[PDB]
Amino acid sequence: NTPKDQEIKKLVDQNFKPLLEKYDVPGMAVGVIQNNKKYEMYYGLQSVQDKKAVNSNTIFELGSVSKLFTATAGGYAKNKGKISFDDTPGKYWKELKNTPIDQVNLLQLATYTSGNLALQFPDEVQTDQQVLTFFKDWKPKNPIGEYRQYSNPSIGLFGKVVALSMNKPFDQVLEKTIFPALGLKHSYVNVPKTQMQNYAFGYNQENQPIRVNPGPLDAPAYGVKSTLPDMLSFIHANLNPQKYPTDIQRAINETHQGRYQVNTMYQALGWEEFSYPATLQTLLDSNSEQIVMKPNKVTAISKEPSVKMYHKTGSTSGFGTYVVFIPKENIGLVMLTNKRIPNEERIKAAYVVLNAIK
Numbered sequence: 001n002t003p004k005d006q007e008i009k010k011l012v013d014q015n016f017k018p019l020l021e022k023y024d025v026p027g028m029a030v031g032v033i034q035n036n037k038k039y040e041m042y043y044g045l046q047s048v049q050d051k052k053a054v055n056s057n058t059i060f061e062l063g064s065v066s067k068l069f070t071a072t073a074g075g076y077a078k079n080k081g082k083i084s085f086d087d088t089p090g091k092y093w094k095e096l097k098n099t100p101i102d103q104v105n106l107l108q109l110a111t112y113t114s115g116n117l118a119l120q121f122p123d124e125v126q127t128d129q130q131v132l133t134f135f136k137d138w139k140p141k142n143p144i145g146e147y148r149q150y151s152n153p154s155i156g157l158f159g160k161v162v163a164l165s166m167n168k169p170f171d172q173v174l175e176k177t178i179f180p181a182l183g184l185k186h187s188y189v190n191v192p193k194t195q196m197q198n199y200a201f202g203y204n205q206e207n208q209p210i211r212v213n214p215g216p217l218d219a220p221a222y223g224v225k226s227t228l229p230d231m232l233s234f235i236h237a238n239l240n241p242q243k244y245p246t247d248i249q250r251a252i253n254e255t256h257q258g259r260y261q262v263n264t265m266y267q268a269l270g271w272e273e274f275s276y277p278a279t280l281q282t283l284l285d286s287n288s289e290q291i292v293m294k295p296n297k298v299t300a301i302s303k304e305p306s307v308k309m310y311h312k313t314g315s316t317s318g319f320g321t322y323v324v325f326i327p328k329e330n331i332g333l334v335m336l337t338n339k340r341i342p343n344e345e346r347i348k349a350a351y352v353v354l355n356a357i358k
C-alpha cells in the first residue's frame, strides 16, 4: 500500500532532510541497504558556486571513515600471512628497529594504545623524512596497551607498515588491491584529474568552500574519498562477508573482532562495536568528547555479545560521514555531507531511521 523505497525515503526526509536547513549544509547523500536492496537519497548541492546537484557520481571526503579501509587492508595482510598483529613496526620499517616505538605492536598501533600518540602529528611534520624522525624520537609515556587515545599517527603508522609488508605504497594497496577486491569502482586515495568534476567542495563553518589538506600519513588515517553507491557496496561487504573470496572475506571479518572495551564501546579494527540491541545513548556515548579527545584506560572484554552492531564517524574540515550496520537485521546506512554536523545528529538520525524500517 506504500512501496518500500517510498517508505524509506519518507523516513530519511523526516530525520535527515531537516538537518540541512538546521545546520546550513549545502549537500547530503543518505543511503540504506536492506537485504541486498539499495536505497539512495540525494539532497542539495555538491558545489554551491557551480550549481552542481549531489548525485550518485558525487565524491565526498570520508575523513576517519578512511580508517575502516586501513583496517581492512591490515586484515587482508594478516590473513595472507604478510604480517602478524603481534609484530612491531621495526620488522617492516627497518629504520625503526630497536627504537622505543618498536616496543609497540601492530594491533596497539591500529587500536590507539601506544600510550603516547595524540590526535594529530605536530604541524611541522610533513615529509616522509620528518615522519620517520618523529617516530625515531618517540618515547613511551603511559603503559603500552592500556590507554586508548584516538590518534591519526597511530593508525597512520599501522597503515604504513601494512603497505610495506605488501611491497606497495599505501595508496596502491587501496586503489589496486583492496578497493577492487571489495568491488569499489569510484573510491580513491588520489582523485584523478578526470574525476575532479565529481569531487564536491567541502564547506566550513562560514559555508566557505574548502577541501582536505595534504598531511603526514594522511591516506590511512583520513584520506579516502568515495561515492554513495561505493559506500553502500562497502556496507554490503561487511553485512555479507561470506559472499566474497576467502582473502577479503577473512579481512572483513578481522575488522569485526573486538579487542578491548571502554565501557559499552568495543574497539574493533577501525570499527566501533556494540552489543545489539544498542540504546541511542550507548551509540552517542561512543563519540563523546571524553572518548574521542582524551586518554581512557581500556578494559579486557569480559562480556562478548552474540549479536553486535558497528559504526564509525568521519570528519574533515569540510565534510561529515557516518556509517552503521547491523548484521542481524541485514541492514546498514551511510550518510555523507559536504559540511560537518554534530556527530550526535548523525547518530540519532540514523538510529531513528534504522529502527523504523519494516
Ligand SMILES: *[B@]([O])([C]N1[C]=C(C([O])=O)N=N1)OP([O])([O])=O
Pocket: 062, 063, 064, 065, 152, 222, 292, 313, 314, 315, 316
Ligand atoms: B576522523 O575524521 C579524525 N579527525 C577528526 C578531526 C577533527 O575533529 O578535526 N581531526 N581528525 O574523525 P572522527 O573524530 O573519528 O569522526
